[PDB]
Design a protein around this ligand. Sequence first.
Ligand SMILES: CN1C(=O)c2sccc2N(C)c2nc(Nc3ccc(S(N)(=O)=O)cc3)ncc21
Ligand SMILES: CN1C(=O)c2sccc2N(C)c2nc(Nc3ccc(S(N)(=O)=O)cc3)ncc21
Lengths: 279, 249
Amino acid sequence: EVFDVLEKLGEGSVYKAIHKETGQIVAIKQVPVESDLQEIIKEISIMQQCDSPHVVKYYGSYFKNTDLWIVMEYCGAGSVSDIIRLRNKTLTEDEIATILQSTLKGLEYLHFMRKIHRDIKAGNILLNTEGHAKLADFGVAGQLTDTMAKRNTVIGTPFWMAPEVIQEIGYNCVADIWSLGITAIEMAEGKPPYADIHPMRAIFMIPTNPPPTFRKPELWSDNFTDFVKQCLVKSPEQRATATQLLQHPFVRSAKGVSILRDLINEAMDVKLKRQESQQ
Amino acid sequence: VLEKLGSVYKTGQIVAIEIIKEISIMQQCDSPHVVKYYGIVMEYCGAGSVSDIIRLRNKTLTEDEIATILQSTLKGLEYLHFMRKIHRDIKAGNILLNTEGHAKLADFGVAGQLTDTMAKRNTVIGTPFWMAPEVIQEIGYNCVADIWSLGITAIEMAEGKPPYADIHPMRAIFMIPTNPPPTFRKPELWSDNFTDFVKQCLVKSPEQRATATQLLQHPFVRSAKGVSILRDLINEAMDVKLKRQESQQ
Ligand SMILES: CN1C(=O)c2sccc2N(C)c2nc(Nc3ccc(S(N)(=O)=O)cc3)ncc21
Ligand SMILES: CN1C(=O)c2sccc2N(C)c2nc(Nc3ccc(S(N)(=O)=O)cc3)ncc21
Protein backbone atom coordinates (compact mmCIF):
# COMPACT_ATOMS: atom_id res chain seq x y z
CA GLU A 1 0.00 0.00 0.00
CA VAL A 2 1.90 3.07 -1.33
CA PHE A 3 -0.75 5.65 -0.45
CA ASP A 4 -2.96 6.38 2.49
CA VAL A 5 -6.07 7.69 0.68
CA LEU A 6 -7.77 10.46 2.69
CA GLU A 7 -10.87 12.71 2.03
CA LYS A 8 -12.49 13.66 -1.30
CA LEU A 9 -11.24 17.13 -2.38
CA GLY A 10 -13.29 20.12 -3.46
CA GLU A 11 -16.87 21.42 -3.09
CA GLY A 12 -15.91 15.05 -7.77
CA SER A 13 -13.47 12.08 -8.07
CA VAL A 14 -10.16 13.50 -6.70
CA TYR A 15 -8.96 12.46 -3.24
CA LYS A 16 -6.18 13.80 -1.01
CA ALA A 17 -3.52 11.15 -0.15
CA ILE A 18 -0.23 10.62 1.70
CA HIS A 19 2.71 8.71 0.15
CA LYS A 20 3.45 6.47 3.23
CA GLU A 21 7.24 6.32 2.63
CA THR A 22 7.92 10.04 2.03
CA GLY A 23 5.05 11.80 3.83
CA GLN A 24 4.37 13.80 0.56
CA ILE A 25 0.78 14.87 -0.14
CA VAL A 26 -0.71 14.01 -3.56
CA ALA A 27 -4.11 14.24 -5.29
CA ILE A 28 -5.45 10.95 -6.75
CA LYS A 29 -8.24 10.86 -9.31
CA GLN A 30 -10.41 7.67 -9.27
CA VAL A 31 -11.35 6.93 -12.88
CA PRO A 32 -14.65 5.00 -13.18
CA VAL A 33 -13.83 1.92 -15.45
CA GLU A 34 -16.86 2.91 -17.62
CA SER A 35 -14.72 5.86 -18.90
CA ASP A 36 -13.28 5.83 -22.41
CA LEU A 37 -9.78 4.53 -21.47
CA GLN A 38 -8.34 5.84 -24.77
CA GLU A 39 -9.28 9.43 -23.65
CA ILE A 40 -7.69 8.78 -20.22
CA ILE A 41 -4.37 7.84 -21.91
CA LYS A 42 -4.38 11.03 -24.09
CA GLU A 43 -4.96 12.98 -20.83
CA ILE A 44 -2.06 11.27 -18.96
CA SER A 45 0.22 11.63 -22.01
CA ILE A 46 -0.50 15.39 -22.26
CA MET A 47 0.39 15.78 -18.56
CA GLN A 48 3.59 13.71 -19.04
CA GLN A 49 4.63 15.88 -21.98
CA CYS A 50 4.37 19.03 -19.77
CA ASP A 51 7.20 20.18 -17.52
CA SER A 52 6.13 23.56 -16.18
CA PRO A 53 5.64 25.00 -12.71
CA HIS A 54 2.30 26.41 -14.02
CA VAL A 55 0.88 22.96 -15.03
CA VAL A 56 -0.18 20.23 -12.55
CA LYS A 57 2.27 17.31 -12.58
CA TYR A 58 1.43 13.63 -13.19
CA TYR A 59 3.26 11.24 -10.82
CA GLY A 60 1.99 7.78 -11.82
CA SER A 61 -1.00 5.42 -11.98
CA TYR A 62 -2.23 2.27 -10.29
CA PHE A 63 -5.03 -0.25 -10.62
CA LYS A 64 -7.08 -1.15 -7.57
CA ASN A 65 -10.46 -2.98 -7.57
CA THR A 66 -10.68 -2.65 -11.44
CA ASP A 67 -10.32 1.18 -11.12
CA LEU A 68 -7.49 3.22 -12.58
CA TRP A 69 -6.16 5.75 -10.05
CA ILE A 70 -4.18 8.71 -11.39
CA VAL A 71 -1.63 10.23 -8.97
CA MET A 72 -1.10 13.95 -9.47
CA GLU A 73 0.37 17.10 -7.86
CA TYR A 74 -1.58 18.31 -4.83
CA CYS A 75 -2.33 22.09 -4.71
CA GLY A 76 -3.00 23.17 -1.12
CA ALA A 77 -5.46 26.07 -1.64
CA GLY A 78 -7.81 24.17 -4.00
CA SER A 79 -9.37 25.55 -7.17
CA VAL A 80 -10.35 29.21 -7.72
CA SER A 81 -14.04 28.17 -7.76
CA ASP A 82 -13.58 26.33 -4.42
CA ILE A 83 -12.07 29.53 -2.91
CA ILE A 84 -14.97 31.64 -4.23
CA ARG A 85 -17.49 29.06 -2.90
CA LEU A 86 -15.82 28.65 0.57
CA ARG A 87 -15.55 32.40 1.30
CA ASN A 88 -18.88 33.13 -0.53
CA LYS A 89 -17.08 36.13 -2.08
CA THR A 90 -15.96 37.03 -5.58
CA LEU A 91 -12.29 38.01 -6.13
CA THR A 92 -10.86 41.52 -6.14
CA GLU A 93 -9.31 42.97 -9.33
CA ASP A 94 -5.84 42.63 -7.80
CA GLU A 95 -6.42 38.93 -6.90
CA ILE A 96 -7.77 38.27 -10.44
CA ALA A 97 -4.81 40.11 -12.08
CA THR A 98 -2.30 37.94 -10.16
CA ILE A 99 -4.10 34.62 -10.79
CA LEU A 100 -4.57 35.36 -14.50
CA GLN A 101 -0.88 36.30 -14.86
CA SER A 102 0.17 32.81 -13.60
CA THR A 103 -2.68 31.20 -15.65
CA LEU A 104 -1.41 33.04 -18.76
CA LYS A 105 2.13 31.68 -18.16
CA GLY A 106 0.69 28.14 -18.08
CA LEU A 107 -1.34 28.89 -21.24
CA GLU A 108 1.78 30.36 -22.95
CA TYR A 109 3.71 27.16 -22.08
CA LEU A 110 0.85 24.84 -23.32
CA HIS A 111 0.32 26.80 -26.53
CA PHE A 112 4.09 26.72 -27.24
CA MET A 113 3.80 22.90 -26.85
CA ARG A 114 0.86 22.99 -29.37
CA LYS A 115 -1.66 21.85 -26.69
CA ILE A 116 -5.20 23.28 -26.27
CA HIS A 117 -6.57 22.78 -22.73
CA ARG A 118 -10.22 23.21 -24.02
CA ASP A 119 -11.64 23.32 -20.45
CA ILE A 120 -10.33 26.60 -18.90
CA LYS A 121 -12.62 27.72 -16.07
CA ALA A 122 -12.06 28.70 -12.38
CA GLY A 123 -12.73 25.10 -11.41
CA ASN A 124 -9.61 24.03 -13.34
CA ILE A 125 -7.24 26.74 -12.05
CA LEU A 126 -5.66 25.37 -8.86
CA LEU A 127 -3.59 27.30 -6.30
CA ASN A 128 -0.76 25.77 -4.24
CA THR A 129 -0.36 26.96 -0.57
CA GLU A 130 2.12 29.64 -1.70
CA GLY A 131 -0.53 31.05 -4.09
CA HIS A 132 0.82 29.87 -7.46
CA ALA A 133 -1.88 29.09 -10.05
CA LYS A 134 -1.65 25.79 -11.99
CA LEU A 135 -3.60 24.58 -15.02
CA ALA A 136 -5.35 21.31 -14.19
CA ASP A 137 -7.74 18.68 -15.72
CA PHE A 138 -6.43 17.76 -19.12
CA GLY A 139 -9.40 15.36 -19.65
CA VAL A 140 -10.56 17.17 -22.79
CA ALA A 141 -7.15 18.65 -23.96
CA GLY A 142 -6.25 18.53 -27.64
CA GLN A 143 -2.91 18.17 -29.39
CA LEU A 144 -1.94 19.98 -32.60
CA THR A 145 0.65 18.14 -34.78
CA ASP A 146 2.48 18.71 -38.14
CA THR A 147 -0.41 16.90 -39.94
CA MET A 148 -3.19 18.42 -37.65
CA ALA A 149 -2.79 22.22 -37.48
CA LYS A 150 -6.43 22.59 -36.26
CA ARG A 151 -8.71 20.55 -34.01
CA ASN A 152 -12.41 19.95 -34.85
CA THR A 153 -13.93 18.37 -31.73
CA VAL A 154 -16.85 20.30 -30.23
CA ILE A 155 -15.75 19.87 -26.64
CA GLY A 156 -15.35 21.81 -23.36
CA THR A 157 -17.87 23.26 -20.85
CA PRO A 158 -20.53 25.23 -22.74
CA PHE A 159 -20.51 28.69 -20.98
CA TRP A 160 -16.68 28.84 -21.42
CA MET A 161 -16.50 27.48 -25.03
CA ALA A 162 -15.15 29.70 -27.84
CA PRO A 163 -17.45 30.50 -30.80
CA GLU A 164 -15.16 28.85 -33.37
CA VAL A 165 -15.14 25.59 -31.34
CA ILE A 166 -18.97 25.47 -31.57
CA GLN A 167 -19.00 26.54 -35.31
CA GLU A 168 -17.08 23.37 -36.42
CA ILE A 169 -14.70 25.32 -38.69
CA GLY A 170 -11.43 24.10 -37.09
CA TYR A 171 -9.67 25.86 -34.22
CA ASN A 172 -6.34 26.25 -32.44
CA CYS A 173 -4.78 27.34 -29.10
CA VAL A 174 -6.45 30.81 -28.95
CA ALA A 175 -9.77 29.01 -28.12
CA ASP A 176 -8.30 28.85 -24.52
CA ILE A 177 -7.94 32.67 -24.60
CA TRP A 178 -11.69 33.08 -25.08
CA SER A 179 -12.27 30.61 -22.17
CA LEU A 180 -9.83 32.70 -20.09
CA GLY A 181 -11.92 35.83 -20.75
CA ILE A 182 -15.07 34.03 -19.52
CA THR A 183 -13.08 32.79 -16.47
CA ALA A 184 -12.09 36.43 -15.67
CA ILE A 185 -15.84 37.37 -15.68
CA GLU A 186 -16.53 34.24 -13.58
CA MET A 187 -13.91 35.21 -10.92
CA ALA A 188 -15.29 38.81 -10.73
CA GLU A 189 -19.05 37.87 -10.75
CA GLY A 190 -19.06 34.34 -9.33
CA LYS A 191 -20.50 32.86 -12.51
CA PRO A 192 -19.85 33.03 -16.27
CA PRO A 193 -22.20 34.97 -18.62
CA TYR A 194 -25.42 32.89 -19.28
CA ALA A 195 -24.97 30.78 -16.07
CA ASP A 196 -28.67 30.92 -15.25
CA ILE A 197 -29.84 29.50 -18.63
CA HIS A 198 -29.44 26.02 -20.18
CA PRO A 199 -25.92 25.09 -21.29
CA MET A 200 -27.33 23.80 -24.68
CA ARG A 201 -29.06 27.21 -25.20
CA ALA A 202 -25.66 28.93 -24.47
CA ILE A 203 -24.03 26.66 -27.17
CA PHE A 204 -26.49 28.13 -29.76
CA MET A 205 -26.10 31.79 -28.61
CA ILE A 206 -22.25 32.10 -28.31
CA PRO A 207 -21.47 32.18 -32.14
CA THR A 208 -24.26 34.72 -32.89
CA ASN A 209 -24.22 36.99 -29.84
CA PRO A 210 -21.80 39.91 -29.51
CA PRO A 211 -18.90 39.29 -27.06
CA PRO A 212 -20.09 39.11 -23.43
CA THR A 213 -19.34 41.99 -21.04
CA PHE A 214 -19.56 42.50 -17.24
CA ARG A 215 -23.13 42.48 -15.84
CA LYS A 216 -22.42 45.91 -14.19
CA PRO A 217 -19.62 47.48 -16.28
CA GLU A 218 -19.43 50.66 -14.11
CA LEU A 219 -18.06 48.55 -11.18
CA TRP A 220 -14.79 47.67 -12.95
CA SER A 221 -11.61 49.45 -13.90
CA ASP A 222 -10.90 50.29 -17.55
CA ASN A 223 -7.87 47.97 -17.70
CA PHE A 224 -9.95 45.03 -16.43
CA THR A 225 -12.76 45.67 -18.90
CA ASP A 226 -10.25 46.06 -21.78
CA PHE A 227 -8.45 42.82 -20.76
CA VAL A 228 -11.81 40.89 -20.92
CA LYS A 229 -12.59 42.57 -24.26
CA GLN A 230 -9.22 41.46 -25.74
CA CYS A 231 -9.86 37.84 -24.62
CA LEU A 232 -13.40 37.88 -26.07
CA VAL A 233 -12.59 38.83 -29.66
CA LYS A 234 -14.90 36.63 -31.77
CA SER A 235 -12.42 36.21 -34.66
CA PRO A 236 -9.81 33.61 -33.50
CA GLU A 237 -7.33 34.86 -36.17
CA GLN A 238 -7.46 38.38 -34.65
CA ARG A 239 -7.56 37.18 -31.00
CA ALA A 240 -4.53 37.96 -28.79
CA THR A 241 -2.15 35.17 -27.75
CA ALA A 242 -1.22 34.32 -24.16
CA THR A 243 2.28 35.96 -24.80
CA GLN A 244 0.61 39.21 -25.90
CA LEU A 245 -1.90 39.20 -23.00
CA LEU A 246 0.96 38.84 -20.47
CA GLN A 247 1.85 42.45 -21.69
CA HIS A 248 -1.67 43.87 -21.20
CA PRO A 249 -1.70 46.66 -18.56
CA PHE A 250 -4.16 44.68 -16.35
CA VAL A 251 -1.80 41.68 -16.22
CA ARG A 252 1.59 43.46 -16.39
CA SER A 253 0.60 45.46 -13.23
CA ALA A 254 -0.08 42.24 -11.23
CA LYS A 255 1.32 42.23 -7.73
CA GLY A 256 3.08 39.09 -6.54
CA VAL A 257 1.51 36.00 -5.06
CA SER A 258 1.81 37.79 -1.60
CA ILE A 259 -1.55 39.60 -2.19
CA LEU A 260 -3.31 36.15 -2.25
CA ARG A 261 -2.27 35.21 1.34
CA ASP A 262 -5.49 36.47 3.02
CA LEU A 263 -7.65 34.97 0.25
CA ILE A 264 -6.00 31.53 0.78
CA ASN A 265 -5.94 31.73 4.60
CA GLU A 266 -9.66 32.63 4.77
CA ALA A 267 -10.69 29.85 2.37
CA MET A 268 -8.57 27.18 4.16
CA ASP A 269 -9.92 28.38 7.54
CA VAL A 270 -13.54 27.92 6.34
CA LYS A 271 -12.66 24.42 5.11
CA LEU A 272 -10.98 23.51 8.43
CA LYS A 273 -13.91 24.81 10.56
CA ARG A 274 -16.36 22.90 8.29
CA GLN A 275 -14.30 19.68 8.77
CA GLU A 276 -14.07 20.24 12.57
CA SER A 277 -17.89 20.45 12.89
CA GLN A 278 -18.22 17.16 10.89
CA GLN A 279 -16.41 15.46 13.88
CA VAL B 1 -39.44 32.06 2.18
CA LEU B 2 -37.89 28.99 3.84
CA GLU B 3 -34.99 26.59 2.83
CA LYS B 4 -33.60 25.83 -0.65
CA LEU B 5 -34.77 22.50 -2.16
CA GLY B 6 -30.39 25.08 -7.79
CA SER B 7 -32.70 28.08 -7.25
CA VAL B 8 -36.07 26.75 -5.91
CA TYR B 9 -37.07 27.50 -2.30
CA LYS B 10 -39.84 26.15 -0.07
CA THR B 11 -53.31 30.51 3.73
CA GLY B 12 -51.25 27.69 5.32
CA GLN B 13 -50.48 26.34 1.81
CA ILE B 14 -46.89 25.32 0.98
CA VAL B 15 -45.43 26.50 -2.38
CA ALA B 16 -42.10 26.26 -4.30
CA ILE B 17 -40.61 29.59 -5.46
CA GLU B 18 -36.99 33.01 -22.30
CA ILE B 19 -38.24 33.18 -18.67
CA ILE B 20 -41.69 34.06 -20.14
CA LYS B 21 -41.67 30.65 -21.96
CA GLU B 22 -41.49 28.57 -18.76
CA ILE B 23 -44.45 30.55 -17.32
CA SER B 24 -46.55 30.69 -20.57
CA ILE B 25 -46.41 26.91 -21.14
CA MET B 26 -47.20 26.31 -17.44
CA GLN B 27 -50.27 28.63 -17.56
CA GLN B 28 -51.53 26.82 -20.73
CA CYS B 29 -51.45 23.50 -18.77
CA ASP B 30 -54.25 22.35 -16.49
CA SER B 31 -53.41 18.79 -15.52
CA PRO B 32 -52.91 17.01 -12.20
CA HIS B 33 -49.74 15.46 -13.76
CA VAL B 34 -48.09 18.86 -14.56
CA VAL B 35 -46.72 21.28 -11.91
CA LYS B 36 -48.96 24.34 -11.53
CA TYR B 37 -47.93 28.01 -11.82
CA TYR B 38 -49.49 30.25 -9.13
CA GLY B 39 -48.05 33.71 -9.80
CA ILE B 40 -41.94 32.40 -9.76
CA VAL B 41 -44.48 30.76 -7.40
CA MET B 42 -45.26 27.14 -8.28
CA GLU B 43 -46.86 23.94 -6.92
CA TYR B 44 -44.84 22.33 -4.13
CA CYS B 45 -44.32 18.54 -4.38
CA GLY B 46 -43.55 17.09 -0.94
CA ALA B 47 -41.35 14.11 -1.82
CA GLY B 48 -38.98 16.04 -4.14
CA SER B 49 -37.67 14.80 -7.49
CA VAL B 50 -37.06 11.14 -8.39
CA SER B 51 -33.28 11.85 -8.55
CA ASP B 52 -33.43 13.42 -5.04
CA ILE B 53 -35.14 10.24 -3.72
CA ILE B 54 -32.52 8.00 -5.37
CA ARG B 55 -29.70 10.23 -3.98
CA LEU B 56 -31.16 10.48 -0.41
CA ARG B 57 -31.74 6.74 0.04
CA ASN B 58 -28.58 5.84 -2.00
CA LYS B 59 -30.73 3.17 -3.68
CA THR B 60 -32.06 2.69 -7.20
CA LEU B 61 -35.82 2.09 -7.67
CA THR B 62 -37.50 -1.30 -7.95
CA GLU B 63 -39.29 -2.28 -11.25
CA ASP B 64 -42.66 -1.80 -9.43
CA GLU B 65 -41.73 1.71 -8.17
CA ILE B 66 -40.52 2.63 -11.71
CA ALA B 67 -43.72 1.20 -13.34
CA THR B 68 -45.92 3.36 -11.06
CA ILE B 69 -43.89 6.57 -11.52
CA LEU B 70 -43.64 6.13 -15.29
CA GLN B 71 -47.42 5.50 -15.55
CA SER B 72 -48.12 8.93 -13.97
CA THR B 73 -45.25 10.49 -16.01
CA LEU B 74 -46.78 9.02 -19.21
CA LYS B 75 -50.18 10.60 -18.33
CA GLY B 76 -48.46 13.98 -18.03
CA LEU B 77 -46.64 13.35 -21.33
CA GLU B 78 -49.94 12.29 -23.00
CA TYR B 79 -51.57 15.55 -21.79
CA LEU B 80 -48.59 17.72 -23.00
CA HIS B 81 -48.36 15.97 -26.35
CA PHE B 82 -52.15 16.43 -26.88
CA MET B 83 -51.49 20.16 -26.22
CA ARG B 84 -48.70 20.02 -28.91
CA LYS B 85 -45.99 20.74 -26.25
CA ILE B 86 -42.58 18.97 -26.10
CA HIS B 87 -41.02 19.09 -22.58
CA ARG B 88 -37.48 18.49 -24.10
CA ASP B 89 -35.90 17.90 -20.64
CA ILE B 90 -37.38 14.67 -19.30
CA LYS B 91 -35.02 13.15 -16.70
CA ALA B 92 -35.50 11.91 -13.08
CA GLY B 93 -34.50 15.38 -11.85
CA ASN B 94 -37.61 16.86 -13.52
CA ILE B 95 -40.12 14.24 -12.33
CA LEU B 96 -41.43 15.44 -8.95
CA LEU B 97 -43.54 13.43 -6.46
CA ASN B 98 -46.14 14.98 -4.14
CA THR B 99 -46.39 13.72 -0.47
CA GLU B 100 -49.06 11.15 -1.59
CA GLY B 101 -46.80 9.80 -4.37
CA HIS B 102 -48.20 11.30 -7.56
CA ALA B 103 -45.61 12.16 -10.24
CA LYS B 104 -45.68 15.59 -11.89
CA LEU B 105 -43.75 16.92 -14.87
CA ALA B 106 -41.70 19.97 -13.90
CA ASP B 107 -39.19 22.52 -15.34
CA PHE B 108 -40.60 23.82 -18.58
CA GLY B 109 -37.51 26.04 -19.11
CA VAL B 110 -36.67 24.45 -22.48
CA ALA B 111 -40.20 23.24 -23.52
CA GLY B 112 -41.23 23.71 -27.15
CA GLN B 113 -44.57 24.46 -28.74
CA LEU B 114 -45.81 23.02 -32.06
CA THR B 115 -48.27 25.23 -34.02
CA ASP B 116 -50.22 25.04 -37.36
CA THR B 117 -47.25 26.73 -39.14
CA MET B 118 -44.55 24.84 -37.04
CA ALA B 119 -45.29 21.07 -37.11
CA LYS B 120 -41.66 20.34 -36.07
CA ARG B 121 -39.16 22.05 -33.75
CA ASN B 122 -35.46 22.45 -34.71
CA THR B 123 -33.73 23.65 -31.51
CA VAL B 124 -30.90 21.38 -30.32
CA ILE B 125 -31.84 21.55 -26.66
CA GLY B 126 -32.20 19.34 -23.57
CA THR B 127 -29.66 17.51 -21.35
CA PRO B 128 -27.18 15.55 -23.52
CA PHE B 129 -27.44 12.00 -22.04
CA TRP B 130 -31.31 12.13 -22.31
CA MET B 131 -31.57 13.83 -25.77
CA ALA B 132 -33.20 11.96 -28.69
CA PRO B 133 -31.08 11.25 -31.81
CA GLU B 134 -33.33 13.31 -34.11
CA VAL B 135 -33.03 16.36 -31.80
CA ILE B 136 -29.21 16.23 -32.20
CA GLN B 137 -29.41 15.51 -36.01
CA GLU B 138 -31.12 18.89 -36.75
CA ILE B 139 -33.73 17.32 -39.06
CA GLY B 140 -36.84 18.59 -37.23
CA TYR B 141 -38.62 16.73 -34.43
CA ASN B 142 -41.91 16.43 -32.55
CA CYS B 143 -43.42 15.20 -29.22
CA VAL B 144 -42.00 11.64 -29.43
CA ALA B 145 -38.52 13.11 -28.64
CA ASP B 146 -39.81 13.08 -24.96
CA ILE B 147 -40.49 9.33 -25.33
CA TRP B 148 -36.78 8.67 -26.05
CA SER B 149 -35.88 10.83 -22.99
CA LEU B 150 -38.39 8.76 -20.96
CA GLY B 151 -36.60 5.54 -21.99
CA ILE B 152 -33.25 6.96 -20.78
CA THR B 153 -35.01 8.10 -17.54
CA ALA B 154 -36.27 4.51 -17.01
CA ILE B 155 -32.63 3.24 -17.29
CA GLU B 156 -31.55 6.13 -14.97
CA MET B 157 -34.15 5.15 -12.28
CA ALA B 158 -33.11 1.45 -12.45
CA GLU B 159 -29.30 2.03 -12.56
CA GLY B 160 -28.90 5.41 -10.86
CA LYS B 161 -27.41 7.01 -13.96
CA PRO B 162 -28.21 7.23 -17.69
CA PRO B 163 -26.21 5.19 -20.28
CA TYR B 164 -22.81 6.74 -21.25
CA ALA B 165 -22.73 8.58 -17.84
CA ASP B 166 -18.90 8.18 -17.68
CA ILE B 167 -18.40 9.54 -21.25
CA HIS B 168 -17.97 13.33 -21.70
CA PRO B 169 -21.40 14.95 -22.41
CA MET B 170 -20.14 16.61 -25.62
CA ARG B 171 -18.62 13.33 -26.85
CA ALA B 172 -21.87 11.41 -25.94
CA ILE B 173 -24.05 13.92 -27.87
CA PHE B 174 -22.02 13.22 -31.07
CA MET B 175 -22.32 9.41 -30.70
CA ILE B 176 -26.14 9.14 -29.79
CA PRO B 177 -27.30 9.42 -33.51
CA THR B 178 -24.92 6.64 -34.68
CA ASN B 179 -24.93 4.38 -31.59
CA PRO B 180 -27.41 1.48 -31.47
CA PRO B 181 -30.22 2.08 -28.89
CA PRO B 182 -28.89 1.81 -25.32
CA THR B 183 -29.72 -1.24 -23.18
CA PHE B 184 -29.49 -2.12 -19.43
CA ARG B 185 -25.91 -2.59 -18.10
CA LYS B 186 -26.94 -6.02 -16.70
CA PRO B 187 -29.93 -7.17 -18.79
CA GLU B 188 -30.41 -10.43 -16.81
CA LEU B 189 -31.56 -8.44 -13.71
CA TRP B 190 -34.77 -7.28 -15.47
CA SER B 191 -38.12 -8.73 -16.63
CA ASP B 192 -38.99 -9.12 -20.32
CA ASN B 193 -41.69 -6.40 -19.86
CA PHE B 194 -39.28 -3.76 -18.44
CA THR B 195 -36.61 -4.47 -21.07
CA ASP B 196 -39.26 -4.37 -23.85
CA PHE B 197 -40.70 -1.09 -22.42
CA VAL B 198 -37.20 0.54 -22.57
CA LYS B 199 -36.69 -0.89 -26.09
CA GLN B 200 -40.02 0.66 -27.28
CA CYS B 201 -38.98 4.06 -25.89
CA LEU B 202 -35.52 3.83 -27.51
CA VAL B 203 -36.57 3.26 -31.11
CA LYS B 204 -34.17 5.40 -33.14
CA SER B 205 -36.74 6.24 -35.86
CA PRO B 206 -39.03 8.96 -34.36
CA GLU B 207 -41.72 8.16 -36.99
CA GLN B 208 -41.86 4.53 -35.79
CA ARG B 209 -41.49 5.40 -32.07
CA ALA B 210 -44.51 4.74 -29.79
CA THR B 211 -46.56 7.63 -28.41
CA ALA B 212 -47.29 8.24 -24.69
CA THR B 213 -50.94 6.96 -25.31
CA GLN B 214 -49.60 3.71 -26.75
CA LEU B 215 -46.99 3.25 -23.98
CA LEU B 216 -49.70 3.63 -21.29
CA GLN B 217 -50.95 0.24 -22.77
CA HIS B 218 -47.55 -1.50 -22.57
CA PRO B 219 -47.64 -4.51 -20.18
CA PHE B 220 -44.93 -2.94 -17.95
CA VAL B 221 -47.03 0.23 -17.44
CA ARG B 222 -50.55 -1.25 -17.59
CA SER B 223 -49.62 -3.59 -14.66
CA ALA B 224 -48.54 -0.65 -12.41
CA LYS B 225 -49.70 -0.89 -8.82
CA GLY B 226 -51.16 2.17 -7.14
CA VAL B 227 -49.29 5.03 -5.53
CA SER B 228 -49.50 2.97 -2.23
CA ILE B 229 -46.33 0.98 -3.20
CA LEU B 230 -44.35 4.30 -3.08
CA ARG B 231 -45.16 5.07 0.63
CA ASP B 232 -42.00 3.42 2.07
CA LEU B 233 -39.85 4.93 -0.72
CA ILE B 234 -41.14 8.45 0.15
CA ASN B 235 -41.04 7.98 3.95
CA GLU B 236 -37.40 6.73 3.86
CA ALA B 237 -36.26 9.61 1.60
CA MET B 238 -38.02 12.30 3.70
CA ASP B 239 -36.58 10.72 6.89
CA VAL B 240 -33.01 10.96 5.48
CA LYS B 241 -33.63 14.62 4.57
CA LEU B 242 -34.98 15.40 8.08
CA LYS B 243 -32.05 13.67 9.86
CA ARG B 244 -29.60 15.55 7.56
CA GLN B 245 -31.31 18.89 8.44
CA GLU B 246 -31.29 18.04 12.19
CA SER B 247 -27.50 17.46 12.18
CA GLN B 248 -27.01 20.86 10.41
CA GLN B 249 -28.40 22.46 13.66
C1 LIG C 1 -4.87 17.04 -9.36
N1 LIG C 1 -5.92 18.03 -9.19
C2 LIG C 1 -6.72 18.21 -10.29
O1 LIG C 1 -6.38 17.84 -11.40
C3 LIG C 1 -8.04 18.88 -10.15
S1 LIG C 1 -8.66 19.66 -11.56
C4 LIG C 1 -10.15 20.04 -10.74
C5 LIG C 1 -10.18 19.60 -9.45
C6 LIG C 1 -8.95 18.94 -9.11
N2 LIG C 1 -8.68 18.66 -7.74
C7 LIG C 1 -9.81 18.62 -6.82
C8 LIG C 1 -7.36 18.73 -7.21
N3 LIG C 1 -7.37 19.23 -5.96
C9 LIG C 1 -6.20 19.62 -5.43
N4 LIG C 1 -6.24 20.26 -4.23
C10 LIG C 1 -7.31 20.63 -3.39
C11 LIG C 1 -7.03 21.15 -2.13
C12 LIG C 1 -8.04 21.68 -1.35
C13 LIG C 1 -9.34 21.67 -1.82
S2 LIG C 1 -10.63 22.37 -0.83
N5 LIG C 1 -11.06 23.77 -1.46
O2 LIG C 1 -11.76 21.50 -0.93
O3 LIG C 1 -10.07 22.64 0.46
C14 LIG C 1 -9.64 21.14 -3.06
C15 LIG C 1 -8.62 20.61 -3.84
N6 LIG C 1 -4.99 19.53 -5.99
C16 LIG C 1 -4.97 19.03 -7.24
C17 LIG C 1 -6.12 18.61 -7.90
C1 LIG D 1 -41.67 23.84 -8.68
N1 LIG D 1 -40.68 22.76 -8.66
C2 LIG D 1 -39.94 22.63 -9.82
O1 LIG D 1 -40.31 23.14 -10.88
C3 LIG D 1 -38.67 21.86 -9.82
S1 LIG D 1 -38.16 21.16 -11.32
C4 LIG D 1 -36.69 20.60 -10.63
C5 LIG D 1 -36.55 20.94 -9.30
C6 LIG D 1 -37.72 21.65 -8.84
N2 LIG D 1 -37.90 21.82 -7.43
C7 LIG D 1 -36.72 21.66 -6.57
C8 LIG D 1 -39.19 21.80 -6.83
N3 LIG D 1 -39.16 21.18 -5.64
C9 LIG D 1 -40.32 20.80 -5.08
N4 LIG D 1 -40.27 20.04 -3.95
C10 LIG D 1 -39.18 19.53 -3.20
C11 LIG D 1 -39.44 18.92 -1.98
C12 LIG D 1 -38.43 18.25 -1.30
C13 LIG D 1 -37.16 18.19 -1.86
S2 LIG D 1 -35.88 17.32 -1.01
N5 LIG D 1 -35.60 15.94 -1.77
O2 LIG D 1 -34.68 18.10 -1.11
O3 LIG D 1 -36.37 16.98 0.29
C14 LIG D 1 -36.88 18.82 -3.06
C15 LIG D 1 -37.89 19.49 -3.73
N6 LIG D 1 -41.55 21.04 -5.57
C16 LIG D 1 -41.59 21.65 -6.76
C17 LIG D 1 -40.45 22.06 -7.44
